[PDB]
Design an enzyme around this catalytic site. Structure first.
Site, PDB file in Angstrom:
ATOM      1  N   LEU A 195      -9.357   3.569   2.770  1.00  0.00           N
ATOM      2  CA  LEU A 195     -10.415   4.097   1.918  1.00  0.00           C
ATOM      3  C   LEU A 195     -11.239   5.154   2.659  1.00  0.00           C
ATOM      4  O   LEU A 195     -11.677   4.931   3.790  1.00  0.00           O
ATOM      5  CB  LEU A 195     -11.327   2.973   1.429  1.00  0.00           C
ATOM      6  CG  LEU A 195     -12.604   3.449   0.741  1.00  0.00           C
ATOM      7  CD1 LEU A 195     -12.281   4.010  -0.632  1.00  0.00           C
ATOM      8  CD2 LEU A 195     -13.605   2.310   0.639  1.00  0.00           C
TER       9      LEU A 195
ATOM     10  N   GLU B  56       0.818  -1.208   0.000  1.00  0.00           N
ATOM     11  CA  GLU B  56       0.000   0.000   0.000  1.00  0.00           C
ATOM     12  C   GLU B  56       0.854   1.262   0.000  1.00  0.00           C
ATOM     13  O   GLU B  56       0.467   2.279  -0.569  1.00  0.00           O
ATOM     14  CB  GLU B  56      -0.954   0.011   1.200  1.00  0.00           C
ATOM     15  CG  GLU B  56      -1.959  -1.136   1.235  1.00  0.00           C
ATOM     16  CD  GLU B  56      -3.062  -0.998   0.199  1.00  0.00           C
ATOM     17  OE1 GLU B  56      -3.019  -0.031  -0.600  1.00  0.00           O
ATOM     18  OE2 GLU B  56      -3.978  -1.852   0.184  1.00  0.00           O
TER      19      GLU B  56
ATOM     20  N   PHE C  47      -8.202  -6.955   2.717  1.00  0.00           N
ATOM     21  CA  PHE C  47      -7.826  -5.583   3.029  1.00  0.00           C
ATOM     22  C   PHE C  47      -8.021  -4.693   1.806  1.00  0.00           C
ATOM     23  O   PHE C  47      -8.474  -3.550   1.910  1.00  0.00           O
ATOM     24  CB  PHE C  47      -6.367  -5.536   3.469  1.00  0.00           C
ATOM     25  CG  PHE C  47      -5.912  -4.181   3.905  1.00  0.00           C
ATOM     26  CD1 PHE C  47      -5.978  -3.814   5.243  1.00  0.00           C
ATOM     27  CD2 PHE C  47      -5.412  -3.275   2.985  1.00  0.00           C
ATOM     28  CE1 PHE C  47      -5.556  -2.570   5.654  1.00  0.00           C
ATOM     29  CE2 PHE C  47      -4.987  -2.024   3.389  1.00  0.00           C
ATOM     30  CZ  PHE C  47      -5.060  -1.671   4.724  1.00  0.00           C
TER      31      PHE C  47
ATOM     32  N   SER D 102     -11.165 -20.619  -6.346  1.00  0.00           N
ATOM     33  CA  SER D 102      -9.844 -20.413  -5.760  1.00  0.00           C
ATOM     34  C   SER D 102      -9.859 -20.663  -4.254  1.00  0.00           C
ATOM     35  O   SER D 102      -8.930 -21.251  -3.701  1.00  0.00           O
ATOM     36  CB  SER D 102      -9.356 -18.994  -6.037  1.00  0.00           C
ATOM     37  OG  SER D 102      -9.501 -18.665  -7.406  1.00  0.00           O
TER      38      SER D 102
ATOM     39  N   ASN E 289      -5.723 -20.489 -10.895  1.00  0.00           N
ATOM     40  CA  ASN E 289      -7.083 -19.981 -10.935  1.00  0.00           C
ATOM     41  C   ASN E 289      -7.121 -18.498 -10.559  1.00  0.00           C
ATOM     42  O   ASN E 289      -7.826 -17.711 -11.186  1.00  0.00           O
ATOM     43  CB  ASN E 289      -7.994 -20.808 -10.016  1.00  0.00           C
ATOM     44  CG  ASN E 289      -9.450 -20.773 -10.452  1.00  0.00           C
ATOM     45  OD1 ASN E 289     -10.312 -20.267  -9.738  1.00  0.00           O
ATOM     46  ND2 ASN E 289      -9.727 -21.304 -11.638  1.00  0.00           N
TER      47      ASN E 289
ATOM     48  N   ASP F 287      -6.856   5.729  -5.142  1.00  0.00           N
ATOM     49  CA  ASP F 287      -6.254   4.410  -5.300  1.00  0.00           C
ATOM     50  C   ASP F 287      -6.440   3.891  -6.728  1.00  0.00           C
ATOM     51  O   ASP F 287      -6.801   4.647  -7.632  1.00  0.00           O
ATOM     52  CB  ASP F 287      -6.776   3.405  -4.255  1.00  0.00           C
ATOM     53  CG  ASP F 287      -8.247   3.048  -4.444  1.00  0.00           C
ATOM     54  OD1 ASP F 287      -8.863   3.466  -5.449  1.00  0.00           O
ATOM     55  OD2 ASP F 287      -8.787   2.327  -3.577  1.00  0.00           O
TER      56      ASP F 287
END
Ligand SMILES: [Cu+2]
Ligand SMILES: [Cu+2]
Lengths: 164, 165
Positions: B35, B14, B107, B120, B135, B23
């Site tokens: 966010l 990040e 996250f 998955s 996958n 972002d």
């Protein structure tokens, strides 16, 4: 900001930047980071230097203490995941209660915590009030009643209301 | 210098920004991928920001402030996994290193988006790392942020921190 295991422990352990003695009389520093079980301040001082990687003359910075705190919390969580007794209990718990558990391991260590055989089963069976009762009967409760009471309420209720 | 963990892992993916930025999805954000709002209004972002920090930030925050949000956010991701019927089981079956990759996914994308990786997820719970790794590469996730997805996937496949070393 809402609670987590970090704030929780941050409250229970507090933050100290000089080497002090925990409630067990063992030398410590930062957020409940055990240096040594020996009654030697000099032994504690060297152990501290290894951990921080420099010479501290007994004093570390706030950042340094959070770094230790991180690794230690991480170490406790990994300890639980390698413990056959604790992992199942841990996995069965909701978030708030996993925090309560990590709290006990952080303070007492795995082995010590695995010893609460009965309480653990009660926990894995969601008999919150019964385990809370049983946990109070413990040496742990008698040696550190205030912190234990807080943790136990978290187990009973599944809320942060003992810390809020 | 100590062993990697989710925080270190997320701190790398990040980065640290002390000013409001958009972002990769376009949403207003700050700090370590916090966010603010999915709304195009900078003013709603600034409002959200000042609310979270409890002062008037003039659109700027300190590193410690940003790490405070980081803690909240990581815990929220974990709590999001433990809240979801499809995520919890996978998470619980994972070793420490792989649980991090998972937390990393939530996250970034959120509880709900990650739960969408039904195939998955099941492969992860069956310990078919390499099948899961493949996958996961055919997904909107991989297209939008291929460099971060590669790290997260490499972690899933190997069970080690080699992708962040
Ligand atoms: Cu907060
Ligand atoms: Cu370290």
């Amino acid at each position: 900001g809402p609670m987590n295991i970090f704030e929780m422990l941050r409250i229970d352990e507090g933050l100290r930047l000089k080497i002090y003695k925990d409630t067990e009389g063992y030398y410590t520093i930062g957020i409940g980071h055990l240096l040594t079980k020996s009654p030697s301040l000099n032994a504690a001082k060297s152990e501290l230097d290894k951990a921080i990687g420099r010479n501290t003359n007994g004093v570390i910075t706030k950042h340094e203490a959070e770094h230790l705190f991180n690794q230690d919390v991480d170490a406790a969580v990994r300890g639980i995941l390698r413990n056959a007794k604790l992992k199942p209990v841990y996995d069965s718990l909701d978030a708030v209660r996993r925090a309560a558990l990590i709290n006990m391991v952080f303070q007492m260590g795995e082995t010590g915590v695995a010893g609460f055989t009965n309480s653990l089963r009660m926990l894995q069976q969601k008999r919150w009030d019964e385990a809370a009762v049983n946990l109070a009967k413990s040496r742990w409760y008698n040696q550190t009643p205030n912190r234990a009471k807080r943790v136990i309420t978290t187990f009973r209720t599944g809320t942060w209301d003992a810390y809020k």
